[PDB]
From a paper:
Aminoacyl-tRNA synthetases (aaRSs) are an essential enzyme family for protein translation and, in several cases, have been validated drug targets. Among the aaRSs, prolyl-tRNA synthetase (PRS) is a validated drug target in Plasmodial spp and Toxoplasma gondii (Tg). In the current study, we examined five ATP-mimetics L95, L96, L97, L35, and L36, based on the 1-(pyridin-4-yl) pyrrolidin-2-one (PPL) scaffold. We successfully co-crystallized all five compounds with TgPRS (L95, L96, L97, L35, and L36) and three with HsPRS (L95, L96, and L97), all in complex with L-pro.
Numbering used by the authors:
A (entry chain A): 1015 to 1312, 1316 to 1512
B (entry chain B): 1015 to 1462, 1473 to 1512
Amino acid sequence: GLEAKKEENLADWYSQVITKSEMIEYHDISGCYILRPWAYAIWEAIKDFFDAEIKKLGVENCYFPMFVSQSALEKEKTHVADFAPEVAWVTRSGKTELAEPIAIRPTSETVMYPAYAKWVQSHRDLPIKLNQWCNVVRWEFKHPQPFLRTREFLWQEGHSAFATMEEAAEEVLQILDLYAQVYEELLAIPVVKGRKTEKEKFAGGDYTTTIEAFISASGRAIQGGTSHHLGQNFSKMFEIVFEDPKIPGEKQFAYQNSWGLTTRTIGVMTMVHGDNMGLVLPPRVACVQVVIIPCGITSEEDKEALIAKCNDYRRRLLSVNIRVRADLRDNYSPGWKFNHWELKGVPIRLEVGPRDMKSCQFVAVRRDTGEKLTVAENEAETKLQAILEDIQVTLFTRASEDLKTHMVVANTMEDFQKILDSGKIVQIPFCGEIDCEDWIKKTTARDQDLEPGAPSMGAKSLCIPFKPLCELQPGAKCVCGKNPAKYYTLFGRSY
Amino acid sequence: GLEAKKEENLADWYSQVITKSEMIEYHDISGCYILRPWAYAIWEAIKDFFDAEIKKLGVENCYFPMFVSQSALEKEKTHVADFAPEVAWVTRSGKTELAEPIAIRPTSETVMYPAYAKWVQSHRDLPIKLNQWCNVVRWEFKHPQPFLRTREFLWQEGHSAFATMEEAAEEVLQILDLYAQVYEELLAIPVVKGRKTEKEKFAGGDYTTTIEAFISASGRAIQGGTSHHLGQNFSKMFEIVFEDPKIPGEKQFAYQNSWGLTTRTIGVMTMVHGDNMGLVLPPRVACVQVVIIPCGITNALSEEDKEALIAKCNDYRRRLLSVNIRVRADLRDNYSPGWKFNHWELKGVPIRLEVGPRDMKSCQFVAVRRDTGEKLTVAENEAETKLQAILEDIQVTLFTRASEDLKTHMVVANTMEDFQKILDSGKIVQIPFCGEIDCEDWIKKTTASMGAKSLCIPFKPLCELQPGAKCVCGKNPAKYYTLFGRSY
Ligand SMILES: Cc1cc(N2CC[C@@](C#N)(C3CC3)C2=O)cc(NC(=O)Cc2ccccc2)n1
Ligand SMILES: Cc1cc(N2CC[C@@](C#N)(C3CC3)C2=O)cc(NC(=O)Cc2ccccc2)n1
Ligand code: PRO
Ligand code: PRO
Ligand SMILES: [Ca+2]
Ligand SMILES: [Ca+2]
Ligand SMILES: [Ca+2]
Ligand SMILES: [Ca+2]
Ligand SMILES: [Ca+2]
Ligand SMILES: [Ca+2]
Ligand SMILES: [Ca+2]
Ligand SMILES: [Ca+2]
Ligand SMILES: [Ca+2]
Ligand SMILES: [Cl-]
Ligand SMILES: [Zn+2]
Ligand SMILES: [Zn+2]
């Protein structure tokens, strides 16, 4: 049974939920977590969708080494200046010192782009569109959080190289739209699409696009995924050059993107939809969508028939592409099974007892609302499908409502401060400068009016939304007062 | 095309094939290699099959950390002694030296089994059946070789814990049989199932089962996959215990297996089926089974005819997709037909489907099998039936050829001079063997090129060991026929 309450101690609730749902186990090293099957299956559902979608775009999967040489790691100055403090270094094998230290990838731009340089000789060798599913290591000494912010994590990183800026620009937004589909259609989490500010953009990149999710339980926002246009910044450093004989002699540098998505998805899903009974799985990613549990059973051969009827429902659901398990163990009581599968967030519990079997009916119990329904055996495939779809809509609708009551506009620093301290994220007119962003962080921390159990921190930028709530009026001032605003920018306390 | 010849410098042939088929690229860290999409797709076909099969056995996928602490790594002393010289160690982040060095997994027993000990708190928590698809590092300084022997490689590693030895022993063999299915049904590679000798078995395990494949062109054998029974060696160290259901208070240690299969699969496929034209893909793992190539698109051909040709190609494409044939239509106009013939030949695509304007106007096409190079003219209306047949025949042919090779090069010998002769003729030999470690080192020393090593004790030997037969050492009696050879 779950006893930690989400609105009381969020961090302890989160830890109880991810362990009792059998999603996470703690490793004997700090910041290292084990993905047990219940969580890994969500990642695999995400993988299946995104893999199919990028393959439609011409992207192919591959696998590049996990190690970088010091020489390659340092060829793009901005990139390495940003990643160097958290790059983990292998310096020996057994007791034998290595030829030279080699680094574990924090990201694979510097692993992959020397090979791209070899592969690009003429204009027809482009585009190059590669993806890999792998682990990366970002060894920060700040406090880790399972799924949300870890030293090692699973992800996918896509890397594409084009002869023209137009093709690259097109791909950046296509990928970002796929990440939005992952969050909104699979995980039932609404997100805000936008551009990262100058301060927050990928070091070494031209510009970074992003999707941002809002976690109302902490009132904080978090980046769900990211799609960068790298311009020619890496092609010039790694010599990814072609010669088009229609532009004789002139070396031409490829235009590049990289884009990434991680198992942070599963953490956001946990934080958004979880409740005080435990995890709540959107049916689109649930490892088990329907769990069948036999009740009653306090007369043999009926008990033998009851088990048979549970397996009948199981086969009927398997036949219609509903993912189903029959918890037929006798080693545990029906109540223990109810609790076990509620903790795990199974969308529907299918209860079968003797009376209902002899009456050609069953009971379906929805996990999002607890609502109980009696269904005729004949309708099992239809109604369950309906309920599954309805659950997915409900989860999304609720999450959407929370986002829209918690994201509002403010046009002055004082209104921004007050709204922010009330637990919301705010679209403000913004001049765009890094220095002004720093000042916003510092002063929104300095001026914070604390609300009970609210996070103590300054506001950061989240994204410049593609579709802001309001149109920037002509000659509007930034909240800094001294510069004209360039755009509405979403700000909030964030992970 | 391809210039280096397989029967000459095998290593240069191998290098040329793996790069010109766009399977491998060299990384700037000597000894590490890039798996380009042509190779990765083979790995993905193998994963699709194996994943489905083990999920039928109750096994579930997970992901454990890449890092091991010094204390967990050394708890099973045999295992750590075997792996310690090739464990890679992280000693700093940025410029900050780490407080304690952390190891990268060479294999995940010592990462997973503390968690297993936490998860088993009664007999009902068993069995535990977990698998992960991931990368491991074994940083030897020997000479690496793409696919076959690398410092970093992708694999799958399965780890199961049971209450009784009978369950564990059953799973060891089920997994070994799936590995043999990967090699024989998917990769068209015959293998020999057997048991490793005491000398060659997994350090810290009780016994190791294996499949061994034979590479005609080198005379050498290579281990394809392995399935180990760890017994209670690891559960005694990591305290994986449950209470006896019948005896109150009595704790019992779980029985464990682990089993692994790597991208070495691809290397063996390349070495067994490749020829002097390049890679040769078995249809069951070929990303592209049929490639459609328009020919004859000269300057004289009308726009009417050229667009009709392209549409004919797309219609073959649709038809082959409708019958589940993995087909690529290569309609690019900025590459010549000959370039495409060569490109897809080097990549080992099973069938090239040629359509020119005259063939379209004759309601037929040309299909060229990669393995034999035979050109067949096929009527349009039979495309789906014939190509399917040919794909099956290709898979059968590749297996039959390789099986003939194995039968040719795996013979029995009962004397040591006979063993030495057959071994230096480029074969592997089943010999009467006493099993002793010292005598295995002795065979290695005497047979040295290099000395032969133990490969497997075959489940099904070629000969019944005649009662009272003496080992090849001529000192102690033989316990079993053992396969020996020069090994990868
Ligand atoms: C789980 C996860 C996710 C992500 N990040 C990053 C942005 C991104 C997005 N979008 C990446 C592009 C894909 C993302 O998901 C980042 C991380 N660790 C870290 O920063 C390192 C660390 C470790 C412990 C504590 C604090 C920091 N850990
Ligand atoms: C690609 C691959 C495969 C395998 N091994 C092992 C046995 C096994 C089987 N069966 C594994 C249990 C599954 C296998 O495939 C082993 C390896 N590297 C190494 O030993 C490290 C190395 C590196 C350079 C030179 C020499 C040695 N590299
Ligand atoms: O780390 C990043 O954000 C980019 C996207 C994936 C690859 N590198
Ligand atoms: O390395 C090995 O041989 C065993 C089997 C896979 C995991 N550990
Ligand atoms: Ca599962
Ligand atoms: Ca950093
Ligand atoms: Ca620009
Ligand atoms: Ca110029
Ligand atoms: Ca207050
Ligand atoms: Ca491919
Ligand atoms: Ca060793
Ligand atoms: Ca005792
Ligand atoms: Ca004809
Ligand atoms: Cl056998
Ligand atoms: Zn400003
Ligand atoms: Zn002997």
